């Protein structure tokens, strides 16, 4: 069980973020 391989606020898709942040909008991870 590991849903977090980034640890930052920048991404390229929803799955590119961590568990605490299941959304990726504007190329930035967010918690919805």
Swiss-Prot record:
Cellular compartments annotated: Secreted
Disulfide pattern: 4-18, 11-24, 17-29
Domain notes: The presence of a 'disulfide through disulfide knot' structurally defines this protein as a knottin.
Stated name of the protein: Omega-hexatoxin-Hv2a
Domain of life: Eukaryota
Similarity comment text for this entry: Belongs to the neurotoxin 15 family. 02 (omega-actx) subfamily.
Shown stretch of the complete protein: 1 to 32 of 45
GO cellular component: extracellular region
Keyword Secreted belongs to the record: yes
Keyword Transferase: no
GO molecular function per UniProt: calcium channel inhibitor activity; sodium channel inhibitor activity; toxin activity
Keyword terms of this UniProt record: Calcium channel impairing toxin, Disulfide bond, Ion channel impairing toxin, Knottin, Neurotoxin, Secreted, Toxin, Voltage-gated calcium channel impairing toxin
Tissue expr: Expressed by the venom gland.
Functional description taken from the UniProt entry: Potent inhibitor of insect (bee brain), but not mammalian (rat trigeminal neurons), voltage-gated calcium channels (Cav). In vivo, injection into lone star ticks (Amblyomma americanum) induces curling of all eight legs into closed loops, followed by death.
